[PDB]
């Protein structure tokens, strides 16, 4: 979902979904 966490510039986890 929007379970997406963005940890810094150009950096994420749980990108899908």
């Amino acid at each position: 979902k929007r379970k997406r966490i963005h940890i810094g510039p150009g950096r994420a986890f749980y990108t899908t979904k």
Partner: antibody, heavy 126, light 113 residues
Framework: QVQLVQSGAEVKKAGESLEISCKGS????????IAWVRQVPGKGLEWMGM????????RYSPSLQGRVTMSADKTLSTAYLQWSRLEASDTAMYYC???????????????????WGQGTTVTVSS | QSVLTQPPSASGTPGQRVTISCSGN????????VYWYQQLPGSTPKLLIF???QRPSGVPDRFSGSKSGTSASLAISGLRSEDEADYYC?????????????FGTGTKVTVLG
């Protein structure tokens, strides 16, 4: 009014099981991560890990021995910090915090612990 | 490892300005976002700044955040007796395959009386 409201003080003995809760309302609770933070009297803040109410995925702080766990009810929109067998050093203040912020220009931040609960104070005597 | 190092205490005269360091690693603060919290005696932590230097609406501009390299700073301008509290930094450590949150050791700010 987005709200995170916790369950309230518990005084216990070493070895007893315990649960504490954190109930989100006035938003879609199953949208955002909830985290748990511990603070021993006089010491500082420690990250315990987090739960995703959507699908109940969890991520635990590397030093959570495996006595302590997290759970989430989509029905009552509530999150739980759980213990099988309490010990003396579990004695602390426990806050819950939800991972989300929105500034007034509609911008959407997904990594920001803006909203916090009042804390649940937990005492364990050995 | 995984420990954000803060000076135990720091101080300022009223109306003056104090800063708190927050020192970490390449696994955390260097490339990852930073956040700051104020904790008044007896009370729930309040978020002061997010993503290095942005402050939520409702927060004065005398709280100011900076970061360069392996470390970061919280500037408190116009020092008031109500700023007297505990300050914690934080960010994400990725030493492991995921997003761990970590708080700094903590800094006690006293306003000289």
């Amino acid at each position: 009014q987005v709200q995170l409201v916790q369950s309230g003080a518990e005084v216990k003995k070493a070895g007893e099981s315990l649960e504490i809760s954190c109930k989100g309302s006035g938003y879609t609770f199953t949208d955002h991560w909830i985290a748990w933070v511990r603070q021993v009297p006089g010491k500082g803040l420690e990250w315990m890990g987090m739960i995703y109410p959507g699908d109940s995925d969890t991520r635990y702080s590397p030093s959570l021995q495996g006595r302590v766990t997290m759970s989430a009810d989509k029905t009552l929109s509530t999150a739980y910090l759980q213990w099988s067998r309490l010990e003396a050093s579990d004695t602390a203040m426990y806050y819950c915090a939800r991972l989300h912020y929105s500034d007034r220009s509609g911008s959407y931040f997904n990594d920001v612990f803006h909203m916090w609960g009042q804390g649940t104070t937990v005492t364990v005597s050995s | 490892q995984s420990v954000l190092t803060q000076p135990p205490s720091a101080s300022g005269t009223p109306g003056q300005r104090v800063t708190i360091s927050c020192s970490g690693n390449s696994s955390n603060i260097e490339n990852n976002y930073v956040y700051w919290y104020q904790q008044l005696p007896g009370s729930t932590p309040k978020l002061l700044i997010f993503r290095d230097d942005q402050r939520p609406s409702g927060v004065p501009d005398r709280f100011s955040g900076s970061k360069s390299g392996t470390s970061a700073s919280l500037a408190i301008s116009g020092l008031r007796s109500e700023d007297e509290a505990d300050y914690y930094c934080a960010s994400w450590d990725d030493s492991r395959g995921g997003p761990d949150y970590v708080f700094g050791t903590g800094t006690k700010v006293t306003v000289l009386g």
